[PDB]
């Protein structure tokens, strides 16, 4: 059964893990992390499934390997939020392109996004 | 006759979908219904003869799509449906803010519409 | 004077629609206009010969939030009366009113710095299920 | 150093406006621009001779969830006292604040990976019914 | 004065067409205009700098039956002469004239209560068989 | 009680108009409305205080063949004397008359199964050349 | 050979039999009747054929069974107008939709249409 | 050259049809000719190379479609025709009131046109 | 005064474009307009409330050859300054200038005998590769 | 009898224009017309009472390569002296000259097999900035 | 190898041989001639190939038979310009329709075009 | 990144062609590249996922089409190319005068684009 990866896993001021979905024919903040995620050079361990949840809503379902589950829980700012089976709810403005592509994913990736000038200061 | 709302519960993650696709006289794609298997009408017969739409405004910014679904399609969609028989003869869908805007700017004038089968994703079966 | 809201209830599905077409200074092309459903009417609005909406109707778009605008207007007496006579909902028009735009509609007003180029009236009828939708 | 929200109440229809204008490095379709009515003011804001806003006003766009983004800012004492003087709602500006982007604006911010190319602050005046709306 | 009919004979297939574009108050959208072929011409109508059709030409739509309208017009001297000089058919324009609309064209005039929003001139050339059609 | 045709001759260009306005229950595309110039009048028609037209004026739409439809009406004595007084063509109104719909109008009437939702009578004034056209 | 069902078979003030054609991808007054046509509960006996007759004209051809031929002749206001093989001429405004559907009929029916307030009075 | 009118006699009830279909730069469908059997040109060859149209106004409200039909198509249409060889090289069709209106509003500007086979109806043979 | 050329260098790929939309008297339809890229800008041009381009800007199309025209213009002080402040290229606008049209653009001006019907401003953003194209 | 080119220098922005207008027998899409600014003039050209231009002015369109075409002309003494008198650039008109068509114009000329149906010469005045442009 | 048929082969005032290409789904001045080309009654001896040469440019390649090569060289105003293998360069305005037809030629021909009123006079 | 111009040398007479076809929101056809053999991507895969365009003005009258070509397509086009490997990741094409005009009037707004194979002509082999 799939558990919701809630908004509280985003903590302003910290760096961000961004999910980035390229559709056939979209960035999503995934996890605030204590430091950048870096796999060893030249190395997926999570599946994504884009599914409709409404007349203009989409959810993203995740299957995350034990290996990446531990690395993410290690790196995460909020405490141990990552489970094996999860989902994110997109809002209508975000769901738009997923709907128009009929949920057909060309490619996805996970990127590190730094913090801006006032970064450490928002953390207090 | 009373127009019943086709609500979001009708879309169930992990199952194939019918997509309502509307062209104004630009292009709306709306997940209409989660179905257990696809939908494919008798030799060369067409949706539009079983399904009437009417776009009207519901306020200063929001718009509704009203529909009359004839008996043959009502029965078929209810059999295919994943959620418990949600199709009534007289229904409406609420368009979102952006979709409403394009409908208003088109003066509610539809060029064409259709229902299309959209298959499930990689983890679909598991999400069920 | 007091500016009273022209509320969404004034639009009644199943009836013809009096639309406000607003054209903003700037923009991309002539496909850019903001159409606002203004009032549901029993019959189309028709104006005296040689008159246009601008002869009876002053508008003013103003911000109401960080991504919201309102459209304020002053309606001359003749139009106020014609509009109350035509309205499906009982006599909703007052001299001084405003329409709340939503965030999608407001974007266009805000990006033009509230500067209206022109505006005019349109009458839109009802679709094939219209009588049925009224009941 | 906790950041206070600059809320909608600080925009008062009928009065001049200070507009915050942000453009991102990409993450936006071609003709989408980010303009935010920032503060209703009693009279225009003027900076002193050759002084770029970036000297008094710092911004940082950051995600607050999977969908929503806030714009955090640090305003120096000069501009703070000036804006609080010009403001219509009573002294709402603090040194450390944030402004909530709407869902659409948040998606452009997210798709731009929060990368700001430039920002600015502009005076926009009131419309023909402005003085009347105030009352 | 006597209003004389501008008859259909004044349109001569094979030649360029001076068109009257009429926009009525109300209506559905900006794709709604009534185009009337006005006169076949030897060359396009060109007007003096800064002048438009409305500076030389007053129109008045009036009903002529239960589903017929006529368009009456008064043509200023300069345009009357330019038009007779350009006309393919020999000198048909008089100061005071009317065009009979048919029942299809009249519908649009009638539904707007004869209220013209604006009007202007267009020049339309001849198609690939045009010279051949002249003979 | 034989019904007399109200013919086109009763519409005289240059003079004000009484417009008969009918809308059917369906049997019409969205933006098609049924407006019929009914009588040219020397001055506007006013009803007395709070008196709905349906009290003086009865209508019945009926087919006259496979394609054409007539609108039959019964006009009470007050309105008849009033319309005959205001009329420009000499006393053409009788108690029992019909009006022929055109082919298009007849098709909307036929497709609506002759079902009238409401009807009304409206004053429309004359255009800028009106007084001149009369003569 | 097919005989024209003329306009004189429509007599104002009387109730109407309406032919109603639904095209794939249109009401027509058919016959004025002395009283409503009612078949016995749960019960076609006429064929229609929509054929072009001009660059913007269509005709409707009818084959009517002996049974319905007699019932219609019984019910008709004008005297015994119904023959076995007939046609109606549509005008251009009526032919429009028949032409745009390439004469492809989804369904047809015959409906009773009452008369309005001034009904009996127009008959005199 | 003299342009001859293609009149309504050319459309004979009960037979298959060629439909002229015109798109302006909305959509005109015009029964063009009653044919004894369909029409289907040589491998991958196209009508437009044998058939030139020119829409022009004939008055303040009516419009005509003028056409030049090249020899190969002239012969073929005359062989297929039901009425006695009515196709000449230079002809015109009169558009109706509504069709005229859309032509005028399009400034006589055609995007595309074509000839399409349309089969007979149920009683067709009998009506012949 | 001296009319100085507003040269092509003033357009800088990668930045938003201030466009001049010009509508000529005559022509075929309302799809006929001549769009001229006028100046690349750091942000969209926004004008004061109730003002349009025509309130600050006079144009004059004149021939410069057998198939070339130039567009001359006089820019009022307020717009000159707003434009120099917005321009990507350093302060290019002077009070009196001209744009060279090429032979394709000139054709439309020439066929209208240089007679402008109306004109207005449009702001066009940058496409998906825009930031990258700037470098 | 060698033909001299009438070059672009003879068109001087800011001054009235004589326009050469040619239409071919076919070889042109419907709405393409051939207008050529011919000579800038200090004041309009008038012909004497009932005298068709063809009496003073002869033209011959001929190819000068696979792509380019010239318009050759023979101008009689009266018109030559008159045009040289009116001209702004000093006496540029000779008895035998040619004018180069541009690539587009040359293609219409080539596709029309150089067949001219008629030609004419028209006065076009100057725009609102005309006197100022001259200087 | 194909040789360019240059513009100098067009001499104003003389009559013209016009190449005329009709595209599937364009006139070109070919040769100024001393007198009209006329083949004997009821009688191609040249191939054309429309090829792209640029993002909006097309060239026309010619293969001309010995027979037509001699007749053309005989008739030509400029001296003996015709070789067996040649090409013409079109400009962008001329290339337009060739590009939009994807270089697919429905038919080509060679036509005689006379000279205008000032014809003999431009030759001097 | 520096945008390199795809110049006319890249089009070599006598060889098949790829045609860039652009639709604005009218229709541009541009010979893009001379290829030694056609181009035909893997089962049901689409150009648009390997190829980004951006139309921008370069002056008061001329317009450029800028493009980012992804690695898979870069390698394929360079292998097929007749001229010596001319495809770089970041390039631009100059539109002609007329093409520029339609781009400007469309406000640089592309509806769709594609690459199409166009075969050689009769004398093609010989011209090589
Ligand atoms: Cl208006
Ligand atoms: Cl974009
Ligand atoms: Cl005008
Ligand atoms: Cl409808
Ligand atoms: Cl403007
Ligand atoms: Cl054409």
Curated annotation (Swiss-Prot), chains B, H, L:
Record bears the keyword Membrane: yes
Listed GO CC annotations: host cell cytoplasm; host cell plasma membrane; membrane; virion component
GO molecular function, one term: identical protein binding
Subcellular location field: Virion; Host cytoplasm; Host cell membrane
Keywords on record: Host cell membrane, Host cytoplasm, Host membrane, Membrane, Viral matrix protein, Virion
Membrane protein topology class: Peripheral membrane protein
Stated consequence of mutating residue 98 to D: In strain: Isolate H1 and Isolate H2
Subunit note: Homooligomer. Homotetramer. Interacts with phosphoprotein P. Binds to ssRNA.
Protein name: Matrix protein
UniProt organism field: Borna disease virus 1 (BoDV-1)
Gene encoding the protein: M
From Swiss-Prot, chains C, D, E, F, I, J:
Keyword Ribonucleoprotein: no
Gene3D superfamilies the record matches: Borna disease virus, matrix protein
Major localisation: virion
Annotated coiled-coil segments of the chain: none
UniProt KW Membrane keyword: yes
Range of residues in the leader sequence: none
Sorted UniProt keywords: Host cell membrane, Host cytoplasm, Host membrane, Membrane, Viral matrix protein, Virion
Pfam assignment, any one: Matrix_Borna
Lineage top rank: taxon: Viruses
Modifications made to the protein after synthesis: Not glycosylated.
Effect ascribed to mutating residue 104 to D: In strain: Isolate H1 and Isolate H2
GO molecular function per UniProt: identical protein binding; structural constituent of virion
Protein residues bound to GMP: 60-62, 113
Membrane topology: Peripheral membrane protein
InterPro entries in the record: BDV_M, BDV_M_sf
Localization per record: Virion; Host cytoplasm; Host cell membrane
GO CC terms of this entry: host cell cytoplasm; host cell plasma membrane; membrane; virion component
Subunit structure: Homooligomer. Homotetramer. Interacts with phosphoprotein P. Binds to ssRNA.
Function: Plays a crucial role in virion assembly and budding.
Name under which the protein is recorded: Matrix protein
Species of origin: Borna disease virus 1 (BoDV-1)
Protein encoded by which gene: M
